[PDB]
Amino acid sequence: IVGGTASVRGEWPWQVTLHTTSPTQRHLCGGSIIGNQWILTAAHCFYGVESPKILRVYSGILNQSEIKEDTSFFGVQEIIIHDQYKMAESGYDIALLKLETTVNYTDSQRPISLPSKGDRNVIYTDCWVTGWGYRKLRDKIQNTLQKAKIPLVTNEECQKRYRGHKITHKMICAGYREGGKDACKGDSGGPLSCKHNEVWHLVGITSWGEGCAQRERPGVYTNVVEYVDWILEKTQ
Numbered sequence: 001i002v003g004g005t006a007s008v009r010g011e012w013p014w015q016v017t018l019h020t021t022s023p024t025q026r027h028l029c030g031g032s033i034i035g036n037q038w039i040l041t042a043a044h045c046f047y048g049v050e051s052p053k054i055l056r057v058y059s060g061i062l063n064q065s066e067i068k069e070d071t072s073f074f075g076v077q078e079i080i081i082h083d084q085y086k087m088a089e090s091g092y093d094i095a096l097l098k099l100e101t102t103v104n105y106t107d108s109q110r111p112i113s114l115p116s117k118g119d120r121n122v123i124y125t126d127c128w129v130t131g132w133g134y135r136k137l138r139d140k141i142q143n144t145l146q147k148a149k150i151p152l153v154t155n156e157e158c159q160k161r162y163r164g165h166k167i168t169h170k171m172i173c174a175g176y177r178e179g180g181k182d183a184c185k186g187d188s189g190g191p192l193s194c195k196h197n198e199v200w201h202l203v204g205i206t207s208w209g210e211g212c213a214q215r216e217r218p219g220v221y222t223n224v225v226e227y228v229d230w231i232l233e234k235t236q
Ligand SMILES: Cn1nccc1-c1cnn([C@H](CC2CC2)c2ccc(-c3c(-n4cnnn4)ccc(Cl)c3F)c[n+]2[O-])c1
Pocket: 027, 028, 029, 044, 045, 046, 047, 133, 137, 141, 182, 183, 184, 185, 186, 187, 188, 189, 206, 207, 208, 209, 210, 211, 212, 213, 218, 219, 220, 221
């Protein structure tokens, strides 16, 4: 996260850190708890992942340094990538992780609701991007989970900033005109979380952008509301 600030414990309890363990253990991507056995993340995260065997899902984590050899984690039973996914910039950047067991929800590990049926025309004005990613394009995975408040941009404006790409209704963009706050390397797969009527909804999945926090180059997110039917079909 560029231009963000440190979170505190329990602040974003649906945020998980997905680790790979091949050839070494490291944070790979963010993700969001959406059910007791289900993480929603980005399909692009699994480029070069040979199988679910090497993945570990950690929940209730504030600092990456909390993770040691005896830290509990969830195994991944299945990676479900959208059947139309080819590359992040062309959309369908969405994946479900089915965990090997059920999360028991606690103050530190909580689900986030999907965008609600009937809220199709809600204007979200309180949206936050979170993660352990870089604070600038040439950096390092951060220890403490970072947060940044970022305004949604219309798809029309977003297309004007990305005239080499097809910005579709299945994407949502977010960013300041002058830049300064954005996701960056290591944040993808995590949530764009928006609060409406004091309830958090998973509005976006952090996906891609041209650089990090550049002026007139918003971050691009998978528009979760357009995949609710797909999510429900897979989780049922
Ligand atoms: C894990 N790891 N450890 C070390 C390095 C990394 C690493 C490297 N790239 N990535 C991912 C993709 C990769 C996981 C398949 C990635 C790709 C793009 C973005 C991104 C950007 N950026 C544009 N230029 N940089 N960022 C801007 C906006 C928005 Cl909205 C974004 F999503 C974020 N991430 O995370 C993780």
